[PDB]
Amino acid sequence: AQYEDGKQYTTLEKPVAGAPQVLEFFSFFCPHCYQFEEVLHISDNVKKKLPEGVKMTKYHVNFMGGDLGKDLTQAWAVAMALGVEDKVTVPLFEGVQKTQTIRSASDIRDVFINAGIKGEEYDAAWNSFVVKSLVAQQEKAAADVQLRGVPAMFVNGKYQLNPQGMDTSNMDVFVQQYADTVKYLSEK
Numbered sequence: 001a002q003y004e005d006g007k008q009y010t011t012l013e014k015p016v017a018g019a020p021q022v023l024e025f026f027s028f029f030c031p032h033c034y035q036f037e038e039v040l041h042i043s044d045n046v047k048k049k050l051p052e053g054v055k056m057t058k059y060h061v062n063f064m065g066g067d068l069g070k071d072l073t074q075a076w077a078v079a080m081a082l083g084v085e086d087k088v089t090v091p092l093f094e095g096v097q098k099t100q101t102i103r104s105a106s107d108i109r110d111v112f113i114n115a116g117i118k119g120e121e122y123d124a125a126w127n128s129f130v131v132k133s134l135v136a137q138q139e140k141a142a143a144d145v146q147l148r149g150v151p152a153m154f155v156n157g158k159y160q161l162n163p164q165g166m167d168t169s170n171m172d173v174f175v176q177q178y179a180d181t182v183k184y185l186s187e188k
């Protein structure tokens, strides 16, 4: 078969019922995640290969970066609650990995302020119980699949993408194979 278990994807031993159809996990501390966002634009290219309107979900994880890692999961919950993911993803990545100017929760907050989210708006969300359950949702989703590594993508709670089984001599061909694999898995 052109696509087979163990090559472009692996199959979860215990599938996860009611999981988001396309679910990505990442960390602002994760170097491949940085490339997946800035150099490869994986989420964008996957979306362009799936039917219009289908739900793609993207969640942050705690297991990289200790205290700041958890702050960033809460900040990502803020970003999702306010709908400003597209505004803060790049400056958070660069603040953590490129300039290394993000060292505290205050520094994370500055990224949002510079992105134009008002201070009162950020702080009210940060302390909201709506963001607490959004944090809980990100944790539960990752715990359901015993996630020990990012970047990760799961399809229908059943299939996990295997980018190590794809060729990386050409960055565009890799993004293609990844997006085409998500499509094939989604139709499975």
Ligand SMILES: Cc1cc(Oc2ccc(CC(=O)N3CCOCC3)cc2)ccc1C#N
Pocket: 032, 035, 039, 040, 148, 149, 150, 151, 163, 164, 168, 170, 171, 174
């Ligand atoms: C062209 C290209 C291909 C890539 O393929 C990848 C190879 C491996 C991973 C997974 C991984 O690292 N994990 C997960 C489990 O264990 C912890 C760490 C992701 C992407 C990565 C980057 C680029 C670029 N530029």
